[PDB]
Structure 1
Amino acid sequence: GAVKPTENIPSPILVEDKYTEETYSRPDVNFKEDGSQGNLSYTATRVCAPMYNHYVGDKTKPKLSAYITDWCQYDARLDGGGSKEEERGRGFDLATLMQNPATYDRLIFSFLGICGDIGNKSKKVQEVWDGWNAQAPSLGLPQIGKGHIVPLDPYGDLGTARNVGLPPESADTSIESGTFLPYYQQNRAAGLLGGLRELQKKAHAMGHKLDLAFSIGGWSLSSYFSALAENPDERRVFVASVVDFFVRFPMFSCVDIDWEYPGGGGDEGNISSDKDGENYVLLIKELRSALDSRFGYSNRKEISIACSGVKAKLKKSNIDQLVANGLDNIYLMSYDFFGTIWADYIGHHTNLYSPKDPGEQELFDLSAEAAIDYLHNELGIPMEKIHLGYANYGRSAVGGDLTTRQYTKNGPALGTMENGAPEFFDIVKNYMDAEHSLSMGKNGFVLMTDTNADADFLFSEAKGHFISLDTPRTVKQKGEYAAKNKLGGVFSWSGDQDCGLLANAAREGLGYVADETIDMGPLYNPGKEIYLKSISEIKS
């Protein structure tokens, strides 16, 4: 039967947020929900209610992991701000997960930085490094130097209470770069580290094991990995500071090294070298050794690394040798395959399947399965070590043409906080209706399904806005692929940008069954079917 949306909203997702709405109207914003005016919405996450369903545990199914960043808690609009860009924040409230504490099997605190960093957050890394070294004599602790991991935001990590699930009296505004060291341990922390401690306890109290991991690096904090990995003295400082973090915060059981990426192809200011892959093997070997001598094999710590979803990049990371030398998990960052400014053609940014005649798959027509197949078939990596990412955000383009796949590379593309990046809670608010028992576009957008790659996107014809995103259908599809192929799991990039719909779709694709907040079943429909030709097909 052809499906029509319901007139009624059986399961409300959207919630009124005065601050978001006020921001749209500001003269430096002029955001109209059909994307016809200002291109940035600055929407807060408060626009969506928590939509998490509760699924029955099942030890035989792949895991669901999520990143949570330390800066998503902020939104200065809650304090009367918002005239400045930086005062409009996401405001993700961890209390939403305290109320649904079994939602994820693992949460990955992100991101720590490294002394030595020379990228855009170098001043902050330096501030904290200096701060640490100022405090250490009085605490009987030694000086730290290049290679040592550090928090980026001592207040957000250890001092806040709002949006981190803690009582207001736990907030401590005296915590800053020059004072945080005594509070840098599990029984003292407030901030997001305190909230994660508390979330993990709430999960345990209702029968759920929530693993906690911490990630070092990520896109903006990767500039110095190449140098520390080359220098055995600095490798030794890095490794010991990893061990030290686990000692400070024993609630963590895994460290994720998010070096993006060995051999280059990360941010262009990163140090890189053709020795990166071989030096990473040395770093993992030494880490695996240090962790296992310190904690042993029963109360064991795992090691995870970021892996590019581009074959040409991940080859530079010697991942077979990493596994041979003690690596536990490979987090496949199979997203950002398309983005405005840099890509020559509009495309899917996080598609699992390759289109017909996808070519070299270096700059376009990429897919998660191409990377997985290379990892498994050419490098012999067991599927169980690989975790498949899904994106809780789109990559958009303006001026898009679905026939030629050309677009306005330098145009103002829709986004929440940055050009071209509409985050999933903002997409649910403005461009995709999931509230009337069907997944469809709204405000002039049409939900489409590309039958070539089998991936979904939103398109609005007037200005040619194209938004590539993960939808409940494609996240369910990724979950199915992970369960069928016995991957280690799927993970959410980033958990704080979902309202629960994609976590639900992931659980259902992975084969978990509800023990509902929202009936996901009618939301898994394809959109308008179109055949987006691969670049090779267009060019021939």
Structure 2
Amino acid sequence: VNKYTYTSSKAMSDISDVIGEPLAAWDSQVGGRVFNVIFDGKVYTNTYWVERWQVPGIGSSDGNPHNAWKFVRAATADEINKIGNPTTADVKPTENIPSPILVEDKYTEETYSRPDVNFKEDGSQGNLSYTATRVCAPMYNHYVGDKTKPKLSAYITDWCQYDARLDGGGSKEEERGRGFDLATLMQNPATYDRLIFSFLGICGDIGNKSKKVQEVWDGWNAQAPSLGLPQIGKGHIVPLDPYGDLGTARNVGLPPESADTSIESGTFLPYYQQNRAAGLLGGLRELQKKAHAMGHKLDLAFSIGGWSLSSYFSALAENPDERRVFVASVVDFFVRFPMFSCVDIDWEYPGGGGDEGNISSDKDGENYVLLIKELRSALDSRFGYSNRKEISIACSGVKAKLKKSNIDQLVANGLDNIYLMSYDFFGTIWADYIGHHTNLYSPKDPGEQELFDLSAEAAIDYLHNELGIPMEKIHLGYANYGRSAVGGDLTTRQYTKNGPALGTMENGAPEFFDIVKNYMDAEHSLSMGKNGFVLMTDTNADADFLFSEAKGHFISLDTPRTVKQKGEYAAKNKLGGVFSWSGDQDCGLLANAAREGLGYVADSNQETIDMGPLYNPGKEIYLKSISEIKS
């Protein structure tokens, strides 16, 4: 564990029991040592770790994000003389850089230069960047066992896979794609307690991608007779891309040895098992091997359904036997991959919502409850309690449809956990006004928090109070991308609808790591807006954002400080658990911050990088709620 010492001295005659400490003016105090520094004639002690932006002045009953940088005013005028008393200040970014942050990408610069991309830091010549994640640094400190705190998790997806810039490419977005090697986290595993690979699917799905469903179903149906195995109908679960999942070596932390990437949907099927599993999924098992070599076993998990593959949820509803066959495929998968700590489902719309392809009825919610219960029953029928699996579903926070989800009965039928989607509240391309797409906290004037100002705390309170559900069964997290909006006016939250907005790859969805590259910085041990792009924060909702006047372009986003705010709240609640959506594109500093928000403590004096200076707030402002502005 980390350890530090200081000392104090007095005349041989005098022994204070208290830690005597040199009386001095405040100036950029920091660390763990006692400080009784003086400012504005008052005398100030931060009875907690000290940070270079923290100020005792405000600190009189403030000065840390939670409590008083307490004070007395014992100082006399001649103390205020012997020490030149401070009365105001502002911490600046230092001149040096205490730690490296990242490395450039040849191919991303080439990308910016591409005559279609034409990307520029200001985005003027190019609204998108498609920046390769390879730019990123490892960025993980190390931490104590800290067993009591709620579990930590992260989401993971196939977009780790490819960037043909590694393969030359140069003409199309996926050639300028994104992806990273899990070797990253492998370098210092146990980074989380649980992980969730992205929602996969089943035969018969309806959405745009269903041609993939067709292809894989074809490969399966071809293999099955040759394998001497029964054919499958709709509802049987799909891996989506076994060649990616297993027929891989790059991006998957394992030597090209045995990576028969030639194998695919029409041929993988024998290998469709953990023992045989090459590539990504096998690597995941190996990471778990390393993890256990340490200890503290990860909850390895994934789910199925989700935003873009939910379409068949209604279709499968009220087809009990096909639902049975589907869950049969579930338990079959379990047998094929008994490594898994659990896997879950990503139904998203008890009442219709999201993509319209997700056809839906009212009864959907009831039927969903029923089948859920039936799933529980089947699961219990398979599993041994010593190795039991316990299931979760997310929730959308849609104040009404979440009610329509009948969580009460789900609990009564042993669905153990819920993960609240806490992000993208701001449907920036279509939303009426700019707002914080991921605000936990209720702003003032809750009068319009129905399709706007959607403080997740409200749903949280519904669940706790209006449904009595223990927090244990519910989990929250954050995502590693903001929103971007054209022409927004900070006074009105009105903004340019439809106008194209920033993303490296996804317009309107600025990508965190690249934000670190372009717009924000910390090299000088601070939260540092850069390249003329405004760093900013609202007092109404503890909101945090970024702006640029030349295109009136706004960005709503989480931050180390803001995820700190989140985790700190969650910790004070003692929630069931914490996680991050889209974990694929944070260096891990936000994870370290998440540890801090969890109160999860580091285990050594050394660091991968600092984190304290990341909690100075941005440009303070008060933003009126949508109701406030309209009223």
CA RMSD of aligned residues (A): 1.3
Instruction: Tell me, in whole angstroms, the C-alpha distance in 2 between the residues paired with 1:12 and 1:310.
Output: 42
Instruction: Tell me, in whole angstroms, the C-alpha distance in 2 between the residues paired with 1:252 and 1:72.
Output: 20
CA shift for structure 1 position 162: 0.5
1:428 aligned residue? 516
Residues 359/144 of structure 1: CA separation in 2 closer, same or farther (3 Å cut): farther
Aligned to 1:107, what secondary structure does the other structure show?
A: strand
CA shift for structure 1 position 462: 1.6
Q: 1:76 aligns with which of 164, 189, 204?
A: 164
Q: Is the 8 A contact 1:213 1:252 kept in 2?
A: yes
Aligned to 1:83, what secondary structure does the other structure show?
A: coil
Instruction: Tell me, in whole angstroms, the C-alpha distance in 1 between the residues paired with 2:402 and 2:617.
Output: 31
Q: Is the 8 A contact 2:163 2:175 kept in 1?
A: yes
Q: 2:384 aligns with which of 296, 305, 313?
A: 296
Instruction: Tell me, in whole angstroms, the C-alpha distance in 2 between the residues paired with 1:195 and 1:144.
Output: 28
Q: Does 1:7 align with 2:98?
A: no
Q: Is the 8 A contact 2:146 2:601 kept in 1?
A: no
| 147-156 or 307-316, larger mean C-alpha shift | 307-316
Instruction: Tell me, in whole angstroms, the C-alpha distance in 1 between the residues paired with 2:258 and 2:416.
Output: 36
| 471-480 or 83-92, larger mean C-alpha shift | 83-92
Aligned to 1:169, what secondary structure does the other structure show?
A: coil
Instruction: Tell me, in whole angstroms, the C-alpha distance in 2 between the residues paired with 1:46 and 1:19.
Output: 10
Superposed CA deviations along residues 187-219 of structure 1, whole A, max 9, x for unmatched, are 111222112111111111122311111110221
CA shift for structure 1 position 360: 4.7
CA shift for structure 1 position 57: 1.6
CA shift for structure 1 position 400: 0.8
2:117 aligned residue? 29
Superposed CA deviations along residues 12-63 of structure 1, whole A, max 9, x for unmatched, are 1221111111101101101101222211110111111011111112221011
Aligned to 1:85, what secondary structure does the other structure show?
A: coil
Q: Is the 8 A contact 1:359 1:365 kept in 2?
A: no
| 348-357 or 436-445, larger mean C-alpha shift | 436-445
Aligned to 1:463, what secondary structure does the other structure show?
A: coil
CA shift for structure 1 position 328: 1.3
Q: Is the 8 A contact 1:81 1:88 kept in 2?
A: yes
Q: Is the 8 A contact 1:392 1:493 kept in 2?
A: yes
Q: Does 1:245 align with 2:333?
A: yes
Q: Is the 8 A contact 1:115 1:146 kept in 2?
A: yes
Q: Does 1:399 align with 2:487?
A: yes
Aligned to 2:376, what secondary structure does the other structure show?
A: helix
1:97 aligned residue? 185
Residues 483/410 of structure 1: CA separation in 2 closer, same or farther (3 Å cut): same
Instruction: Tell me, in whole angstroms, the C-alpha distance in 2 between the residues paired with 1:312 and 1:502.
Output: 32
Residues 429/327 of structure 1: CA separation in 2 closer, same or farther (3 Å cut): same
- TM-score normalised to the size of structure 2? 0.83
CA shift for structure 1 position 359: 3.2
Superposed CA deviations along residues 323-362 of structure 1, whole A, max 9, x for unmatched, are 1111111010010100322111011011110111233533
CA shift for structure 1 position 434: 2.4
Instruction: Tell me, in whole angstroms, the C-alpha distance in 1 between the residues paired with 2:217 and 2:522.
Output: 46
Q: Is the 8 A contact 1:94 1:165 kept in 2?
A: yes
Instruction: Tell me, in whole angstroms, the C-alpha distance in 2 between the residues paired with 1:21 and 1:340.
Output: 28
Superposed CA deviations along residues 149-198 of structure 1, whole A, max 9, x for unmatched, are 10111111121111111111232222212111111110111222112111
CA shift for structure 1 position 71: 2.7
Q: Is the 8 A contact 1:62 1:488 kept in 2?
A: yes
Instruction: Tell me, in whole angstroms, the C-alpha distance in 1 between the residues paired with 2:627 and 2:285.
Output: 50
Superposed CA deviations along residues 497-536 of structure 1, whole A, max 9, x for unmatched, are 1110111111111011111111111101110111111111
CA shift for structure 1 position 263: 1.4
| 73-82 or 356-365, larger mean C-alpha shift | 356-365
Instruction: Tell me, in whole angstroms, the C-alpha distance in 2 between the residues paired with 1:415 and 1:149.
Output: 33
Aligned to 2:545, what secondary structure does the other structure show?
A: strand
Residues 473/170 of structure 1: CA separation in 2 closer, same or farther (3 Å cut): farther
Percent pairwise identity? 100
Instruction: Tell me, in whole angstroms, the C-alpha distance in 1 between the residues paired with 2:552 and 2:578.
Output: 32
Instruction: Tell me, in whole angstroms, the C-alpha distance in 2 between the residues paired with 1:297 and 1:478.
Output: 34
| 397-406 or 282-291, larger mean C-alpha shift | 282-291
Aligned to 2:302, what secondary structure does the other structure show?
A: strand
Instruction: Tell me, in whole angstroms, the C-alpha distance in 2 between the residues paired with 1:458 and 1:272.
Output: 38
Instruction: Tell me, in whole angstroms, the C-alpha distance in 2 between the residues paired with 1:360 and 1:286.
Output: 39
Aligned to 1:213, what secondary structure does the other structure show?
A: strand
CA shift for structure 1 position 403: 0.7
Instruction: Tell me, in whole angstroms, the C-alpha distance in 1 between the residues paired with 2:237 and 2:573.
Output: 35
Superposed CA deviations along residues 227-277 of structure 1, whole A, max 9, x for unmatched, are 212321221122111111111111112122111222112212112111122
Instruction: Tell me, in whole angstroms, the C-alpha distance in 2 between the residues paired with 1:468 and 1:185.
Output: 42
| 81-90 or 446-455, larger mean C-alpha shift | 81-90
Aligned to 1:388, what secondary structure does the other structure show?
A: strand
Superposed CA deviations along residues 286-344 of structure 1, whole A, max 9, x for unmatched, are 22112222112221112010110221231221111111111111010010100322111
- TM-score normalised to the size of structure 1? 0.97
Q: 1:264 aligns with which of 352, 355, 365?
A: 352
Instruction: Tell me, in whole angstroms, the C-alpha distance in 1 between the residues paired with 2:289 and 2:210.
Output: 34
Q: Is the 8 A contact 1:388 1:478 kept in 2?
A: no
Instruction: Tell me, in whole angstroms, the C-alpha distance in 2 between the residues paired with 1:190 and 1:303.
Output: 27
Q: Is the 8 A contact 1:309 1:367 kept in 2?
A: no
Aligned to 1:230, what secondary structure does the other structure show?
A: coil
Instruction: Tell me, in whole angstroms, the C-alpha distance in 1 between the residues paired with 2:538 and 2:314.
Output: 39
Q: Is the 8 A contact 2:435 2:556 kept in 1?
A: yes
> What is the number of equivalent residue pairs in this alignment?
538
Instruction: Tell me, in whole angstroms, the C-alpha distance in 1 between the residues paired with 2:385 and 2:98.
Output: 49
Superposed CA deviations along residues 456-512 of structure 1, whole A, max 9, x for unmatched, are 111112211111111001111111122111111111111111110111111111011
Instruction: Tell me, in whole angstroms, the C-alpha distance in 1 between the residues paired with 2:203 and 2:449.
Output: 35
CA shift for structure 1 position 435: 2.3
Instruction: Tell me, in whole angstroms, the C-alpha distance in 1 between the residues paired with 2:208 and 2:145.
Output: 41
Aligned to 2:620, what secondary structure does the other structure show?
A: strand
| 69-78 or 352-361, larger mean C-alpha shift | 352-361
Aligned to 1:87, what secondary structure does the other structure show?
A: coil
Residues 482/169 of structure 1: CA separation in 2 closer, same or farther (3 Å cut): same
Instruction: Tell me, in whole angstroms, the C-alpha distance in 2 between the residues paired with 1:441 and 1:116.
Output: 48
Instruction: Tell me, in whole angstroms, the C-alpha distance in 1 between the residues paired with 2:286 and 2:490.
Output: 48
Q: 1:44 aligns with which of 132, 135, 148?
A: 132
Residues 317/360 of structure 1: CA separation in 2 closer, same or farther (3 Å cut): farther
Aligned to 2:277, what secondary structure does the other structure show?
A: coil
Q: Is the 8 A contact 1:263 1:272 kept in 2?
A: yes
Task: Report 1:430-445 matches (<5 A).
Answer: 430-445=518-533
Superposed CA deviations along residues 97-129 of structure 1, whole A, max 9, x for unmatched, are 110111011111123112121112111111111
Q: Is the 8 A contact 1:111 1:152 kept in 2?
A: no
Q: Is the 8 A contact 1:71 1:156 kept in 2?
A: no
1:324 aligned residue? 412
Instruction: Tell me, in whole angstroms, the C-alpha distance in 1 between the residues paired with 2:486 and 2:315.
Output: 39
Q: Is the 8 A contact 1:13 1:50 kept in 2?
A: no
Q: Is the 8 A contact 2:162 2:174 kept in 1?
A: no
Q: Is the 8 A contact 2:168 2:175 kept in 1?
A: no
Instruction: Tell me, in whole angstroms, the C-alpha distance in 2 between the residues paired with 1:401 and 1:162.
Output: 45
CA shift for structure 1 position 73: 2.1
| 391-400 or 85-94, larger mean C-alpha shift | 85-94
Aligned to 1:482, what secondary structure does the other structure show?
A: helix
Aligned to 1:456, what secondary structure does the other structure show?
A: strand
CA shift for structure 1 position 430: 1.0
CA shift for structure 1 position 440: 2.4
CA shift for structure 1 position 412: 1.2
Bigger relative contact order, structure 1 or 2 (CA pairs below 8 A, ≥6 apart): 1
| 413-422 or 285-294, larger mean C-alpha shift | 285-294
2:619 aligned residue? 528
Task: Report 1:183-198 matches (<5 A).
Answer: 183-198=271-286
Instruction: Tell me, in whole angstroms, the C-alpha distance in 2 between the residues paired with 1:92 and 1:63.
Output: 24
Q: Is the 8 A contact 1:41 1:417 kept in 2?
A: yes
Q: Is the 8 A contact 2:144 2:601 kept in 1?
A: yes
